[PDB]
């Protein structure tokens, strides 16, 4: 959900292989729950610069 | 919702006509729902000073 | 809820007598609703350095 804190907007982003850690499980669904690499250790800030 | 992060409390606050942009729809309800004028472009800070 | 903003994690913290205010009422449940002593007036910080 964006700046307007009332509604959400689903997007898509494509990571790479070495940028995700996935939770293994017996889930048969075609969707694989999977977090980011290091978002449970410390908040990571972008490099929104040149 | 207040500082105590629970048990929200309804308020009122009346604006002027030059401070709202309201979506137009076919809704018949007596309540017109809409947002601020520039709250979907950047956060606006109060001027809590003299 | 913790840093992974998708799930909850219950803890227990054992406070002291002089650091809690509890709601008074006709409730019969064995659980007593209480808040921190001074979190409805300001945000409190931790004496985080040594």
């Amino acid at each position, epitope marked *: *959900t964006g700046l307007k*804190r*009332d*509604k*959400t907007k689903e997007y898509n982003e494509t990571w790479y292989s070495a940028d995700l850690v996935c939770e293994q499980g017996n889930n048969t669904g075609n969707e694989s729950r999977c977090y980011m690499n290091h978002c449970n250790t410390s908040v990571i800030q972008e490099s929104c610069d040149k | *919702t207040g500082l105590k*992060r629970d048990k929200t409390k309804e308020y009122n606050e009346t604006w002027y006509s030059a401070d709202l942009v309201c979506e137009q729809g076919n*809704n*018949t*309800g007596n309540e017109s729902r809409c947002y601020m004028n520039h709250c979907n472009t950047s956060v606006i800070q109060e001027s809590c000073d003299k | *809820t913790g840093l992974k*903003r998708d799930k*909850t994690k219950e803890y227990n913290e054992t406070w002291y007598s002089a650091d809690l205010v509890c709601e008074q009422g006709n409730n019969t449940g064995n659980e007593s609703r209480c808040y921190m002593n001074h979190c409805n007036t300001s945000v409190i910080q931790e004496s985080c350095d040594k």
Partner: antibody
Amino acid sequence: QVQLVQSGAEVKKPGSSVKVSCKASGNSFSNHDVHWVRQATGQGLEWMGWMSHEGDKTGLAQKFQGRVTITRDSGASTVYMELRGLTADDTAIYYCLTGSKHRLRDYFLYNEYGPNYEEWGDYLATLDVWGHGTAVTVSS
Amino acid sequence: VVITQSPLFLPVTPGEAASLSCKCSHSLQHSTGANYLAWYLQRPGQTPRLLIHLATHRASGVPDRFSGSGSGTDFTLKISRVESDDVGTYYCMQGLHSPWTFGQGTKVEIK
């Protein structure tokens, strides 16, 4: 092609209560919603209530508000619908039927502290399998 | 919230087309764009059979002659080449707000 089995017809005095029992082959109720419909001879169909297959949102109709109670056995093996305050107008054939729902989000307040505030509402779309029905006669 | 079904009584000559109307106007405060409406046919001595769901999609096994159309408040059900098998009462089921209700129904016979 799920099969629904309902209890036999009953005859009751005015002002008493009836408790119907409904079952689905293969415990289909554990994955599909449950509903209840009635109709009087020569009259239109009348809706009664429902209950989510997850068992979260349970309610009744405005007409029978407080007059009916819907309950199921653990595991959704059986579903029981109980009605009280019977009268002559209550004489109807009571039907047990399955279905599903479209649980969508109706509100959202991104709570920066703690979890997010979500509100969900259930809207009835699917009505696939109908039960044979139970005939109830309110008479002395 | 009420439902108006017209006409009450619709004699149809065999091989002719038929039109049924189920109108709802109390869509207070909205929620989902596609208001849920479901059409069912109850033949004598038979359980009601689903015909249309979401007001535009045919149900499984329904012949193409049964078509449901409409959006917003006014909806219509169109039947082509009516036959004896189509004799019965057509019910339109609101699927918007809790509690939900049946439609008063429209009676169709062979003229």
